[PDB]
Amino acid sequence: EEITFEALKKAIDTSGMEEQEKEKRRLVIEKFQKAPFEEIAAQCESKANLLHDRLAQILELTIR
Amino acid sequence: TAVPPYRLRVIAEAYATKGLCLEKLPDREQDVITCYEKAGDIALLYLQEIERVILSELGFFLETGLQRAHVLYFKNGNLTRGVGRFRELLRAVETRTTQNLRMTIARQLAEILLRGMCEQSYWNPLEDPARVYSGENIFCPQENTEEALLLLLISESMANRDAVLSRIPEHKSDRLISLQSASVVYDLLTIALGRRGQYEMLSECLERAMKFAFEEFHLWYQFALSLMAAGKSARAVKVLKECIRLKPDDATIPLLAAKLCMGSLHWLEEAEKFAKTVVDVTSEFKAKGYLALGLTYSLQATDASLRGMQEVLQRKALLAFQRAHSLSPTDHQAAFYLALQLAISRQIPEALGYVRQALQLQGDDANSLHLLALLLSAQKHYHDALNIIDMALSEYPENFILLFSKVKLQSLCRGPDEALLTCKHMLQIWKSCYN
Amino acid sequence: GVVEEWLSEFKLPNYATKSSLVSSLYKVIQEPQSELLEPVCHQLFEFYRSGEEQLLQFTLQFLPELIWCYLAVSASVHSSGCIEALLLGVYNLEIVDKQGHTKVLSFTIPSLSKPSVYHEPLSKVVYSGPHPQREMLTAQNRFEVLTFLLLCYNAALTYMPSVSLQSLCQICSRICVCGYPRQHVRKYKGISSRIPVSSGFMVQMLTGIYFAFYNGEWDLAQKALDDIIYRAQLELYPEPLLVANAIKASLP
């Protein structure tokens, strides 16, 4: 595709994005206060494991 | 009513004598403390009424019979009663004869009011946990900080008046006492004001107390350190020089002076002089001095105008960096800066090894990842550099230089569409981060 | 395993008011080699939804030990990653969950020229907030929320026992010296790494440690202050050095 100068001219101008923060807060609340807690431990353990994996990957890519 | 005051004075003295006698014989202690409280109240009435009569000199029993009761409370642990007694003492009408007692009680209240309670254990003076100043236009205290700051302000305002002006003709006791009082009150003020982060007011207050300072290291050092936090530079540099003159034994002061010289003020000769002074005098301080001297030499190299002195400054800087690294092998900043300086001479493998060692020391540095990514550009390995830039952006999704490097690298490897996408993302980020 | 019987009998407002429950919790949490860490941890989190204070204050004193243990073990090893969930939850409930609005802490500056209650001859200043809510932990915003939770913990200093202050100062001792030769003089053994601390963190650290001097603990506070001032002098941080120097010259 292509990108036009009007795209940037409308990106700089505000588009009225002061209303979705309410539903963002509501979804954060629905994810924390009432969502199940058992899978949170599993997903954060997986996140830590993938962080370790990518750290090892970059460490082994540094030498090469 | 219509009672001569000397009768109140003598009955208060009798109350104090009985209270002294009541305890010295084998509950009733509460009655004795109540007698002390009523003696203090009648003494306050006596002093206020005698002052009123005089306006139309030996305070001996009020202070004892009142303070020592809540001193016994402190020995027992009745903090609330003592706080209430102090509040009712301070809220009373001022007395010119007991201004020193007002000073003392205010200082005692301020000393304990910052290190003896919590936020939820605070109450306004107008509710429970002779003439009294009142009205609706007065400033009602709200929190501990407000009233503590007000008490410190009034104590400082009155304590400046009673200064002996550091007379030192032949006697020194009075000046020493005044200096100790000023030091403690200003220390309380600065410790109270530091926790909230209003440094301009603190700097102004410290500057207000510079009349007493003639040959004092502490006040000058405190003022100099307070000046730097606010943002002012030239006055900070001058006071740092004066402090260096005062006591030439430490190394932190010239290091801070050199840092300020190297910073936004953009001066060079003074930084070199301070670095040489530091290196003239454990091992960490001299390593830091060597690093600062090398940084100054490297900075002078960029702003040159001819050929030879550039190489001379570069070789001096690399020698200084090598010496600093040799003197201390357990700091990643020195290794990173040595790798950065070495890369200027286009010697690639040695700089790569040094930056690898620096990453081994610390693998989360922002600038180290950028340097590693930029090093691969000279070796013509574009995808790996792109991946490193991607990892760095994952760490810092709010930086600017890394994304500029990302745009530059994308424009050379994949195509312009990704560059346009990154540019519009950066525009959106800039709009989000500002108003 | 008294906590096991406690959870068996638990899963009404007078549940709290135990003599040795705090000791048992310290015993189980002092090491990461436990098995009921996640159930008991989400149970500790389950004490926070209720609005009463005798529960939040009863459960709030355990934060520094777990923070040190997890943020030092991770900076080395298996990582649970679920303590960050509780930290983010308490941060969210203290930044947003009051009534629907956020928190804007502010106060006034008294003016001497204006007659007051105690004497006769103010603009709002915000020191914290608003803080946008966090969802994950990274190396860019972790110290901010850590400092915010430390500030939250530093608002009810009276209630916690002396053991909490002892643990706090013990953590404060070796955290800022863990990666320097100075700790080798003090004979500390464990992880030989370093943590890139921030200025506000140590400012709140000094604010917290200043209270411990007049509550029995004397030598530990003094050595912690010496370590803090040494680290600040090595790192060239003006404000912590100023605070430490001010505290030094006010001891009888």
Numbering used by the authors:
A (entry chain H): 724 to 787
B (entry chain D): 131 to 156, 167 to 196, 213 to 285, 310 to 461, 465 to 618
C (entry chain E): 7 to 17, 24 to 29, 34 to 92, 95 to 139, 157 to 287
From the study:
The lipid kinase phosphatidylinositol 4 kinase III α (PI4KIIIα/PI4KA) is a master regulator of the lipid composition and asymmetry of the plasma membrane. PI4KA primarily exists in cells as a complex with the regulatory proteins tetratricopeptide repeat domain 7 [TTC7 (two isoforms TTC7A and TTC7B)] and FAM126 (two isoforms FAM126A and FAM126B). PI4KA self-assembles through its dimerization domain leading to a dimer of heterotrimers, which we will refer to as the PI4KA complex. Fundamental to PI4KA activity is its targeted recruitment to the plasma membrane by the lipidated proteins EFR3A and EFR3B.
Here, we report a cryogenic electron microscopy structure of the C terminus of EFR3A bound to the PI4KA-TTC7B-FAM126A complex, with extensive validation using both hydrogen deuterium exchange mass spectrometry, and mutational analysis. Investigation into the molecular basis of how EFR3A regulates PI4KA required the production of a stable PI4KA-TTC7B-FAM126A complex. This was achieved by coexpression of full-length PI4KA and TTC7B, together with a truncated FAM126A lacking the disordered C terminus (1 to 308, FAM126A ΔC). To address this problem, we subjected the complex to limited BS3 [bis(sulfosuccinimidyl)suberate] chemical cross-linking followed by size exclusion chromatography, with this complex eluting at a volume similar to the noncrosslinked complex. EFR3A C terminus was bound to both sides of the heterotrimer. Our cryo-EM structure revealed that EFR3A engages TTC7B and FAM126A in an extended interface composed of three α-helices from EFR3A oriented in a V, resulting in a buried surface area of ~1500 Å2. This interface is primarily hydrophobic, with the interface between EFR3A and TTC7B being ~800 Å2 and consisting of the first EFR3A α-helix (residues 728 to 735) and the latter half of the third EFR3A α-helix (761 to 785). The α1-helix in EFR3A is amphipathic, with the hydrophobic face primarily interacting with hydrophobic residues in three helices in TTC7B (residues 599 to 616, 690 to 707, and 712 to 723). There is an extended evolutionarily conserved interface between EFR3A and FAM126A. This interface in EFR3A is composed of the C-terminal region of the α2-helix (741 to 756), the N-terminal region of the α3-helix (761 to 775), and the residues between these two helices (757 to 760). No direct interactions were seen between the EFR3A C terminus and PI4KA, with no major conformational changes in the PI4KA subunit.
